[PDB]
Tab-separated table of C-alpha atoms in Angstrom:
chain	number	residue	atom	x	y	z
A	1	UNK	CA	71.876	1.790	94.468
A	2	UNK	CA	68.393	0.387	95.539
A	3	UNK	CA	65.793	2.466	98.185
A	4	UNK	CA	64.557	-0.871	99.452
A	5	UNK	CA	66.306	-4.392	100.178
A	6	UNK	CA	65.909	-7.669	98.871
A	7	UNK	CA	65.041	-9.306	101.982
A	8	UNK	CA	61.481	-10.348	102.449
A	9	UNK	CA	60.028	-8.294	105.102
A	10	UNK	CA	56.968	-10.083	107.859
A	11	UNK	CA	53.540	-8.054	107.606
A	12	UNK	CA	50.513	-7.954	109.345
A	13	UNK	CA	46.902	-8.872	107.486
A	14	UNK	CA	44.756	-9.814	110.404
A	15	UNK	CA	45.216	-9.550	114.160
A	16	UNK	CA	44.613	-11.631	116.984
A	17	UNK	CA	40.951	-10.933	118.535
A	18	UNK	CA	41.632	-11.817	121.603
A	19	UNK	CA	43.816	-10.636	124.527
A	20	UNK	CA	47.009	-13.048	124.738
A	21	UNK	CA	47.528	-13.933	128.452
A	22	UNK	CA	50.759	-11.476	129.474
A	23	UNK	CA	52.344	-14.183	131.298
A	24	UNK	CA	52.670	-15.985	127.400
A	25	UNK	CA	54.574	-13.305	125.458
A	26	UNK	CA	58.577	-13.565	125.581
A	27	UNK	CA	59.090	-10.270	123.403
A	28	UNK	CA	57.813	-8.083	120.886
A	29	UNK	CA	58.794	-6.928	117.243
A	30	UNK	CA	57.331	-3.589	114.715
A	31	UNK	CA	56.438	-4.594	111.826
A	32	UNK	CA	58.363	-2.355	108.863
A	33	UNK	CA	56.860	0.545	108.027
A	34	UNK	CA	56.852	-0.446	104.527
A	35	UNK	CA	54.106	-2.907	105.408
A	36	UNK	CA	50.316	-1.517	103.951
A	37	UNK	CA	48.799	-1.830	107.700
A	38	UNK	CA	50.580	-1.445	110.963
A	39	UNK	CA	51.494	-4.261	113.191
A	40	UNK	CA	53.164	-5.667	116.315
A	41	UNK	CA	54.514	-9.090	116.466
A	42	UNK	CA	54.247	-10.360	119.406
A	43	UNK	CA	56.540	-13.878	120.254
A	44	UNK	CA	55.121	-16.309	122.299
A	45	UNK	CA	57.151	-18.277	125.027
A	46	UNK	CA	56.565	-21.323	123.416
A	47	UNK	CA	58.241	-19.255	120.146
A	48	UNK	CA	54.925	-18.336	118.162
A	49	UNK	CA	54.268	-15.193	115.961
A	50	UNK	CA	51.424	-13.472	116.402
A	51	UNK	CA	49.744	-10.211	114.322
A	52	UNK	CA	48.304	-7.771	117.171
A	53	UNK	CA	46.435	-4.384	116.577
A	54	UNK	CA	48.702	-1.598	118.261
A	55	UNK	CA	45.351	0.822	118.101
A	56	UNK	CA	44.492	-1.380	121.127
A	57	UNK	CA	45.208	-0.657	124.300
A	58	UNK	CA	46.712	-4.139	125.772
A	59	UNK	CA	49.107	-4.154	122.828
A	60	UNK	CA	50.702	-1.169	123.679
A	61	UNK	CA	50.622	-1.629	127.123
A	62	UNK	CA	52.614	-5.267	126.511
A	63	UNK	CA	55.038	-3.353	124.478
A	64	UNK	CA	55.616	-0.575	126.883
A	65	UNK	CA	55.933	-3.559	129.509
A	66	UNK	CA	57.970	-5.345	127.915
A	67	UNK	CA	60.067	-2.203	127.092
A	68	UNK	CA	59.977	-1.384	130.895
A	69	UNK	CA	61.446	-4.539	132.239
A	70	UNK	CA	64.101	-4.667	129.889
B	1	UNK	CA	88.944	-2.915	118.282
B	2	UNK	CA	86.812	-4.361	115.578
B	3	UNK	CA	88.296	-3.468	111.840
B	4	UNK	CA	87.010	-4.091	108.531
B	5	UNK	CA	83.731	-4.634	110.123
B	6	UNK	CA	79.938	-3.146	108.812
B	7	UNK	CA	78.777	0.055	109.363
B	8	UNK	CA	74.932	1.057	110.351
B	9	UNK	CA	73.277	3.116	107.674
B	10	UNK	CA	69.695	4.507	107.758
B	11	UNK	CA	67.870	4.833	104.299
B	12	UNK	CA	64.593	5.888	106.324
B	13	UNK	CA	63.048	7.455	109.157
B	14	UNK	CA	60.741	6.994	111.367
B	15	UNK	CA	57.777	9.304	110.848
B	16	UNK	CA	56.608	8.572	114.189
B	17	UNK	CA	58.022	9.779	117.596
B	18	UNK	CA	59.319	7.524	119.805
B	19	UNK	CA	58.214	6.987	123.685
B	20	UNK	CA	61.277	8.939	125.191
B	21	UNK	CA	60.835	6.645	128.573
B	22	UNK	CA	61.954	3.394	125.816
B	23	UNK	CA	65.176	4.970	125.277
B	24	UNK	CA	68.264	3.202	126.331
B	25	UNK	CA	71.192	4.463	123.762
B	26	UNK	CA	71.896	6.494	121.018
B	27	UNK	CA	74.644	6.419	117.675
B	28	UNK	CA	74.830	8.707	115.166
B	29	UNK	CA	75.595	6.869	111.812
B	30	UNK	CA	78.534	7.294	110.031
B	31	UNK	CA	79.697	10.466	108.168
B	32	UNK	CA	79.965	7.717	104.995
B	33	UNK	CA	76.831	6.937	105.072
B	34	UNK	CA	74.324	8.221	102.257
B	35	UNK	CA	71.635	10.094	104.485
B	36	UNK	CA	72.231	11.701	108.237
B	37	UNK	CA	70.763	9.450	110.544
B	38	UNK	CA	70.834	9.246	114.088
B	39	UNK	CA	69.725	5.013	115.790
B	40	UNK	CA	67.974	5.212	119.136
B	41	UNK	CA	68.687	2.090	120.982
B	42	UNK	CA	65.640	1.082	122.901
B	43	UNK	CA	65.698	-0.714	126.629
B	44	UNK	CA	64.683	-4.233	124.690
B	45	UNK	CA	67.446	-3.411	122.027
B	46	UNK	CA	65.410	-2.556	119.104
B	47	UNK	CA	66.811	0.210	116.858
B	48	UNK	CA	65.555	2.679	115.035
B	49	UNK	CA	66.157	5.232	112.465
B	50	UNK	CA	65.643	8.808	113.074
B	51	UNK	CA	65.782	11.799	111.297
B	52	UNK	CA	68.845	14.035	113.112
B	53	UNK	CA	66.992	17.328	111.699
B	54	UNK	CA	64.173	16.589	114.032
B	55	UNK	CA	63.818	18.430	117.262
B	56	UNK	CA	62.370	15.492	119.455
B	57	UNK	CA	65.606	13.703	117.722
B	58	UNK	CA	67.852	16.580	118.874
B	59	UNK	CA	65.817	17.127	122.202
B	60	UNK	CA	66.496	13.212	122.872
B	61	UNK	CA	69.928	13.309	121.912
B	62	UNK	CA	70.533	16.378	124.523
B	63	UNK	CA	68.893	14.463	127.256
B	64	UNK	CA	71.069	11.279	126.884
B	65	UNK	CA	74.000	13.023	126.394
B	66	UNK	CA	73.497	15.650	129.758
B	67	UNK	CA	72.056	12.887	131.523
B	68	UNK	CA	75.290	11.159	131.646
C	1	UNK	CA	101.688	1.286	126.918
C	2	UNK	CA	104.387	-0.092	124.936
C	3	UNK	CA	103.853	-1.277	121.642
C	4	UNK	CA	100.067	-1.249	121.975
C	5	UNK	CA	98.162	0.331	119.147
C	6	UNK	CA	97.363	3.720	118.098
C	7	UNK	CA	94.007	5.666	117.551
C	8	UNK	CA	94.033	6.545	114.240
C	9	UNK	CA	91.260	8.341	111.703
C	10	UNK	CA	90.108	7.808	108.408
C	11	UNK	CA	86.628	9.156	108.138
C	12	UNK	CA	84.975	12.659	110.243
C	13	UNK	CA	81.983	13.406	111.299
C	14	UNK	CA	79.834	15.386	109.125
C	15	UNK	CA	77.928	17.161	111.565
C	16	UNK	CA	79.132	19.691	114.125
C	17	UNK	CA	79.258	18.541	117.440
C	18	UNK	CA	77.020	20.423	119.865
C	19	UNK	CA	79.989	21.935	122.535
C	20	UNK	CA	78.326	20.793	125.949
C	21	UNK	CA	78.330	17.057	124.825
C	22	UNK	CA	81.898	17.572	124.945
C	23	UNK	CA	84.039	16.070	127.928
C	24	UNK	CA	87.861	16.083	126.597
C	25	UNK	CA	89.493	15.684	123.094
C	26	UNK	CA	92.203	13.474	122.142
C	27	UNK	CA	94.802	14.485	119.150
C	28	UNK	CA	95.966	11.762	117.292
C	29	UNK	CA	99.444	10.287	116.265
C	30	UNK	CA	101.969	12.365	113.578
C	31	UNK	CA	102.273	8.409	112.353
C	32	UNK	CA	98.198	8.184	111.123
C	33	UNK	CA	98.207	8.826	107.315
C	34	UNK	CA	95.296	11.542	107.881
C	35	UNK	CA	95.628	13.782	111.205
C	36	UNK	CA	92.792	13.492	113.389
C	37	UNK	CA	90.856	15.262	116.166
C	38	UNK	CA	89.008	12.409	118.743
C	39	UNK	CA	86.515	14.330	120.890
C	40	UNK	CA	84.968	12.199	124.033
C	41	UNK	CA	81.396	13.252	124.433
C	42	UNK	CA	80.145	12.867	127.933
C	43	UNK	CA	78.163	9.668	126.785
C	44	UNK	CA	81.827	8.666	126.155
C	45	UNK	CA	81.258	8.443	122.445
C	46	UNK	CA	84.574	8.750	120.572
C	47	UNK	CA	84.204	10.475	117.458
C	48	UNK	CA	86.545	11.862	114.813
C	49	UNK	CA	86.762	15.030	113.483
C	50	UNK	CA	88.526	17.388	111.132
C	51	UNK	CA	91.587	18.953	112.257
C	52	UNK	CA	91.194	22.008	109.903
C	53	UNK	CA	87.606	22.723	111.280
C	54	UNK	CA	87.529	26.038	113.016
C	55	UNK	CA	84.873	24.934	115.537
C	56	UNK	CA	87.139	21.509	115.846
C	57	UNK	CA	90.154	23.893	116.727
C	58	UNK	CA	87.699	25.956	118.812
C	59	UNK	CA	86.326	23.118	120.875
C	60	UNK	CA	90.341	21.707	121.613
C	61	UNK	CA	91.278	25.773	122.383
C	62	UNK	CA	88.058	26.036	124.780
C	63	UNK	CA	89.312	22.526	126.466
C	64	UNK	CA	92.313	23.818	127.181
C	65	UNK	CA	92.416	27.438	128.153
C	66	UNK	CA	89.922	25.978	130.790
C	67	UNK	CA	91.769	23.039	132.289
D	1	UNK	CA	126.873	1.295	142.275
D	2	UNK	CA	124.999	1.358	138.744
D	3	UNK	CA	125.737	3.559	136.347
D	4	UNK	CA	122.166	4.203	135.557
D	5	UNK	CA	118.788	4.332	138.030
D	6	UNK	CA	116.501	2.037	137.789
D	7	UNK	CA	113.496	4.486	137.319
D	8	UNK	CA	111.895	4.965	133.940
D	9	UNK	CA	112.848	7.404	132.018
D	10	UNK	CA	110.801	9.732	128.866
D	11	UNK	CA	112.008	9.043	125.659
D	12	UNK	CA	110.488	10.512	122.661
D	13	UNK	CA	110.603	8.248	119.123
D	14	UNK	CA	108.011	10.117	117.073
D	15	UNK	CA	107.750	13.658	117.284
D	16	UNK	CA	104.227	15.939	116.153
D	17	UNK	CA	104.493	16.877	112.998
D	18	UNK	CA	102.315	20.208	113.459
D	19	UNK	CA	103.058	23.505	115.903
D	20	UNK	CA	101.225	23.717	118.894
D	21	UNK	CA	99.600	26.539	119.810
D	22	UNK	CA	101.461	28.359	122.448
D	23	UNK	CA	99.095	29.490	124.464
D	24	UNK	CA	98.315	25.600	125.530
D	25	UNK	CA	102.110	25.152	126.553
D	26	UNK	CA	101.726	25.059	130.641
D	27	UNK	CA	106.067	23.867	130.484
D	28	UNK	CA	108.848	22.131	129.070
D	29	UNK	CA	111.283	19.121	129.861
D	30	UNK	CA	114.761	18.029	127.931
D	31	UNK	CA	114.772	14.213	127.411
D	32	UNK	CA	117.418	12.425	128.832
D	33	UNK	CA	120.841	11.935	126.947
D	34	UNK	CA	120.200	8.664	127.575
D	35	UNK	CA	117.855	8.641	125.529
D	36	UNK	CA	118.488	7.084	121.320
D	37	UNK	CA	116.761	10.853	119.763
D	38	UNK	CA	117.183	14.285	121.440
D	39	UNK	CA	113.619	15.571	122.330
D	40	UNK	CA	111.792	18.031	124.348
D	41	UNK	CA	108.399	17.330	125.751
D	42	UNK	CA	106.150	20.263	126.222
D	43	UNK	CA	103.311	20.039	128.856
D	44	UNK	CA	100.148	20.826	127.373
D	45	UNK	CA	97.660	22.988	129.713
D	46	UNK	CA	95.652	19.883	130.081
D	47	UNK	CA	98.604	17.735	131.285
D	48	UNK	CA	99.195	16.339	127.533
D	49	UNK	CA	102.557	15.524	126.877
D	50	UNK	CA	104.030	16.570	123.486
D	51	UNK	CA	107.213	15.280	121.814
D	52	UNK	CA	108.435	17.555	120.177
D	53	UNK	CA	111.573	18.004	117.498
D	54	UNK	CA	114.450	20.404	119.187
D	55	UNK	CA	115.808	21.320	115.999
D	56	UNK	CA	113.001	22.887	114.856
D	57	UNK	CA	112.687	26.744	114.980
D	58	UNK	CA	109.362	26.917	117.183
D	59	UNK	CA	110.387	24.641	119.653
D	60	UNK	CA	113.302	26.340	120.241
D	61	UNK	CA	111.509	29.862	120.469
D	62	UNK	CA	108.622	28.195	122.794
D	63	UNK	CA	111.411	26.837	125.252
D	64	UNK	CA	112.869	30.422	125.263
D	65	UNK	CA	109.734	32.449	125.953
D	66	UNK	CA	109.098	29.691	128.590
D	67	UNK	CA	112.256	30.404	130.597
D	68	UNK	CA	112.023	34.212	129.669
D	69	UNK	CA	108.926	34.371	131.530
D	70	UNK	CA	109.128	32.418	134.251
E	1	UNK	CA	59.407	-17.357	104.450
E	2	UNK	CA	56.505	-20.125	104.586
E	3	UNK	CA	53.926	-21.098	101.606
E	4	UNK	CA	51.231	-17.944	101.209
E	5	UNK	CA	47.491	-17.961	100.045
E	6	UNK	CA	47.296	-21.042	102.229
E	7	UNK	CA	44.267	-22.068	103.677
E	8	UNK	CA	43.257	-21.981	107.424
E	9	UNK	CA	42.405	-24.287	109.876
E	10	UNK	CA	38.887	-23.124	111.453
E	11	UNK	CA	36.384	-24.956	114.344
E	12	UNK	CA	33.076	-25.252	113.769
E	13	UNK	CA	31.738	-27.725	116.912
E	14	UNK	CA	34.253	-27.811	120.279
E	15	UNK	CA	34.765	-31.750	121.832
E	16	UNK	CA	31.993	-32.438	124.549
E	17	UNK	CA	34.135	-34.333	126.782
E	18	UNK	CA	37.522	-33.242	128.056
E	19	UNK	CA	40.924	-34.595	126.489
E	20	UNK	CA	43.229	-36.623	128.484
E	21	UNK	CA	46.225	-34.267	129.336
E	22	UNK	CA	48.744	-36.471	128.900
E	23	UNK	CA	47.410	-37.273	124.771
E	24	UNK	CA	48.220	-33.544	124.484
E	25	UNK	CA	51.357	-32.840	122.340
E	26	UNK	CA	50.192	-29.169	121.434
E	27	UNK	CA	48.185	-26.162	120.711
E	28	UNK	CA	46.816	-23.758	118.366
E	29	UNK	CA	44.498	-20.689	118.072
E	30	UNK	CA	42.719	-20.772	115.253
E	31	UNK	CA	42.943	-17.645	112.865
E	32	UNK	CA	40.577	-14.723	114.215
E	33	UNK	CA	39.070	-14.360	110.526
E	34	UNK	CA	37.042	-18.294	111.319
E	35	UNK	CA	33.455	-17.329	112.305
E	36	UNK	CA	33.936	-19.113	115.448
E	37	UNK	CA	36.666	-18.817	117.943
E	38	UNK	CA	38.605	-22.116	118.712
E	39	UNK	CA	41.766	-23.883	119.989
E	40	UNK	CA	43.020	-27.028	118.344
E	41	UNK	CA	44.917	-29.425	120.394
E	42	UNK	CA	47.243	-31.757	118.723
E	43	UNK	CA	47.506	-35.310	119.980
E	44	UNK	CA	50.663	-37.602	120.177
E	45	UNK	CA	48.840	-39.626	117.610
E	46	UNK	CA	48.565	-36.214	115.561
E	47	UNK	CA	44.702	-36.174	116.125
E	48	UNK	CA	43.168	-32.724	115.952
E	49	UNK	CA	40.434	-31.640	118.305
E	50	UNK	CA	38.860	-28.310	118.673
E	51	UNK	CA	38.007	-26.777	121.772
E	52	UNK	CA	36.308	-24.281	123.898
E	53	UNK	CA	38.685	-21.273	124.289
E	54	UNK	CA	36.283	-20.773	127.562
E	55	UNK	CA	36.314	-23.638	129.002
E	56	UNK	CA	38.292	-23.695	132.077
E	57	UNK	CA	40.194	-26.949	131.197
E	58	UNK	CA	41.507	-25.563	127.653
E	59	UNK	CA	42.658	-22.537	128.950
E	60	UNK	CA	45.003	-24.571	131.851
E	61	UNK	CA	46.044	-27.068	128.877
E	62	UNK	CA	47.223	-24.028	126.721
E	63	UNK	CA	48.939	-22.451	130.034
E	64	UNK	CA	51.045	-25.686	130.864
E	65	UNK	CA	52.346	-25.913	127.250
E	66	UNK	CA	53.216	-22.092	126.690
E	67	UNK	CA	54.923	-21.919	130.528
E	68	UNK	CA	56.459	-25.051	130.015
E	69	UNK	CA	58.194	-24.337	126.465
C-alpha cells in the first residue's frame, strides 16, 4: 500500500574527521538512500557505529577492502 | 525446500552503479512482486536493488550468468 | 526416488529469459494443479515458466533437437 | 528358481496429461505386465523418460511411426 | 533507536599525566563537531578523563581495547 516502511531507518549528520585505524573496523553498512546526506557506517571491532564521508578516499578504500576480503 | 516462506521485493533502485568487482550473486525478484527488480548479492552479503531495464544491470547479469 | 516430492509451479516468471543463460529445462508433473516449465540457467537458477509461452516452447524445442 | 528377477523393473503410475511433440521422441518401451497399469515410456531426445497412456490415440500412432521407420 | 537532540560530550584540556592502564574500562572519540579533538577514557570507578588523541600512550590504550573486544 505504502512507498516507504515503518521501520526507522540510521542516517548520517556528521562524519568522523579522522582516519579510523583499518585494523579497528569489523564491517561496513550504506546508509539508505532515503537519508538527506550520504553515509557509510562503519562497525568497529569493539561493535561501535561510526558516520564516515564516502567522498573520501580511505572510506571507500575500507569498503572496497572490506568488500575484497570477503 | 522452504514453503510458505517470504519473498524479496524491491520498491526502489539504486540510482547509482555498482563496483562490478563487489559482485558475488544475483536473483531476480519474483514475478509477484509489484515492480521488476533484479538483487545483486555483494562479496560481504549486502544486497541491493536494481533496476532490470538498466544495461550495466543486464551487462552484470550476462557476466555472472556466462561466467559460470 | 520413491515417494520423494515433486517440483511443482504456482507462479512464472514475468520476464523472458535470455536463451544462452539456459543449460537444460525440466517439465513438471501431470499431478501439479498448474503445468509448469523449470528452466536451469547455467548459474543453476531454477525458474518457472509458462508452458503456453512460445519462446518457453521454443527454448524446450531448441534443447532438444540439439541434445 | 524364482518366478520373477530380482532387477528393477519401470512401472508407470501417472501418465502426462499433454502430447509430446514427436519430433523429441528418440524411442519407445512397453512396461512390464508385471506391472499394476499398462504403460509405454517414450524416450525423449534428451534421455527424458515419458509415461505415457497406451490407450490414447497419439501414443498409439507415435509407437507405429516409430517401428515404421526404423 | 536511542534518545535524539542529545547533547555531546566534548574535551576542552587533555590529562597531563598518563592514566594507569589497568583503571581503564573504556574509550570514546568525542564527536568531530567539538572544537577540539579528544578521547575520553572511562575508568572502573566510571571517572572520565580526556586525552590527547596524539599522544603515543592514548593511541596504544584505544588499540588494546578495540583488538581485544
Amino acid at each position: 500500500a505504502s512507498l516507504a516502511a515503518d521501520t526507522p531507518t540510521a542516517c548520517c549528520f556528521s562524519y568522523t574527521s579522522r582516519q579510523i585505524p583499518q585494523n579497528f573496523i569489523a564491517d561496513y553498512f550504506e546508509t539508505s538512500s532515503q537519508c538527506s546526506k550520504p553515509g557509510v557506517i562503519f562497525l568497529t571491532k569493539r561493535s561501535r557505529q561510526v558516520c564516515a564521508d564516502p567522498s573520501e578516499e580511505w572510506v571507500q578504500k575500507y569498503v572496497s577492502d572490506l568488500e575484497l576480503s570477503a
